[PDB]
Design a protein around this ligand. Sequence first.
Ligand code: ADP
Length: 641
Amino acid sequence: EDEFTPRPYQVELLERAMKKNTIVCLGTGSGKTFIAVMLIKELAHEIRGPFNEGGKRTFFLVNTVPLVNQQAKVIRKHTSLKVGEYVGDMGVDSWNKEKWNQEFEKHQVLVMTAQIFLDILNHGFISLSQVNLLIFDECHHAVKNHPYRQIMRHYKNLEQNDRPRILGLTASVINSKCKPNQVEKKIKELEATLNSRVVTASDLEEVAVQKYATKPKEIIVSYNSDRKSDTSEVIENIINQALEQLSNIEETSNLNDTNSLKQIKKVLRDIKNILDELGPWCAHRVIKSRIRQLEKRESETAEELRTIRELLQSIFEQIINVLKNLEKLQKNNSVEFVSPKVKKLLEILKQYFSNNNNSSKELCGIIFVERRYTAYVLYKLLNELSAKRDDDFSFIKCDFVVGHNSSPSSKEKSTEMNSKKQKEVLKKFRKGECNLLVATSVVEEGIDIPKCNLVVRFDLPKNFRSYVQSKGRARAKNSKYIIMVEEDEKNKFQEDLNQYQEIEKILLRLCHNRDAPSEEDFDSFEDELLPPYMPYGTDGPRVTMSSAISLLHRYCSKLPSDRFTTLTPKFTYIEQNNEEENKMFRCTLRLPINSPLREPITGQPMPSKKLAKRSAALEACKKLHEMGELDDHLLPVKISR
RNA sequence: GUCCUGAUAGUUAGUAU
RNA sequence: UACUAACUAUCAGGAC
Ligand SMILES: Nc1ncnc2c1ncn2[C@@H]1O[C@H](COP(=O)(O)OP(=O)(O)O)[C@@H](O)[C@H]1O
């Protein structure tokens, strides 16, 4: 059951938004989704009506795939309207005009990603004259060449009576580092782009009392890294000798070995960093994993790096002999096993999480890390430590979550996630049987997670938005926010925290009424260096400078050729300097042999290589359409056998 | 499970003016 | 302040 009775500030915000374009700024849990749903319900009298003579429909936009299901479910639950869902997996590329028209006629509210909406707009399937309300989710992304900004260019050229109402939702207006004197400039730029107003609640005290009364308490904890033990210094000396002999080999290096020797250099640096930050046991684990993963890579490699791997195995042997020698006397020595930072983290856990476990209360906690290897190793260590049936560690169950779709061009990284397993892990966390989670900045925003009693910043935030979001994650009663900082950087972090506090104070000051943008402010929209290509006038499909290379690559890919060869186009550059005293770049392009066009194509002289490439792609698109490889809708020809 | 193309954010070096 | 080259974290769209 939802809160049928709205709060007074919700009603005030709805009344304000019904009049003009507005952007709502509120903290998490205020209920911005409820406001959006209510606004959709209010204007429901313009939606019903056939689409073949001038009907209108309402659109919703999001950033990530999982949010589609959440928002569709919320809308379907709270109100009784037909709702559709569309993402990039159903192969919506191959649809024709008739299928799109049928879908538009059948539904009343649509929820799709931004890229799909842009693709629909560019190819002439909708003219933006049949939209009654358009909603931006996480509106603070509209900067530079983001799809949100490219959508507004079509809004720019419309008439006065065709303009649909625009609404946006956000939590932090700024999205990057900003000294306290640039906040007004950033806010004005954002307001100019979206052509709306930034407003907040006039009863923010009531909102804070009702919901934000669970505001977390900040605690700063310091640690010192110059407390290495005898094992640490012994291993450090071992790596020192190893890097000395490696430098000797680099002095005696030759061709086809400098790259290999640099690979050994980076491996040794990684090992040293892991040992310094985490401790000896993690170094042992990483060395063993590196051996087991390089076991498969032994084939078709030069003998010199086999010898290097042999000496690496020798250092493995000596270090494991030393580790066993101490283990014969350590008997699971906690202080020697881990670095000082891990000891401090363990102390914090005992101080707060175990103490809460002593009381009859539920436990939920998250740990934020920067890299991915660190998250994996921390989960391994915590599980291993809890497995020993310790008195204080028998109630801690740990799992980790890493970003999907984040496959690099290398570093398979020992069971990368890159799949739907995020859904399974999050379902585990919501259901129960998991109190502690390790996350590499992937659950920060736009995901439903349960209330957490404790949040730990194992690493420092990098800008205002990250700090605000991570602070807002914790919402349970008596929640605590903890930041761990080295000793020598305390003053620098204190200055940065003061800056963040000042920015937050200015943002709250913004609560007062603000002047609406003038028409010239909207006219301050920048223009691209070259105009688009409209073959059928202003109402037809277009090709833009920012949507040409991808289209060319798609057309090349759909060519009939061998499945083992992509046959992508190739590019070259030529540089020249003219009397403007700024170096000029001119690009060039060539097509694969399969396409009917075999001729070099040259773009305009452009200041940067990016723009030269874009110009060449645009000219190639022109030449392709003139020949007849693209249909009436500027799509690749869909001829099939 | 592979192989391409775009978008945003932090750091390092060289180079203007 | 603009350009060139490396490293780290996140997202979307089409091929086999
Ligand atoms: N009328 C209401 N007033 C306040 N809170 C409400 C109301 N109706 C529902 N809620 C609750 O507020 C929560 C808002 O969720 P969500 O949209 O994620 O927060 P936010 O809008 O801050 O992102 C919902 O989980 C819902 O249970």
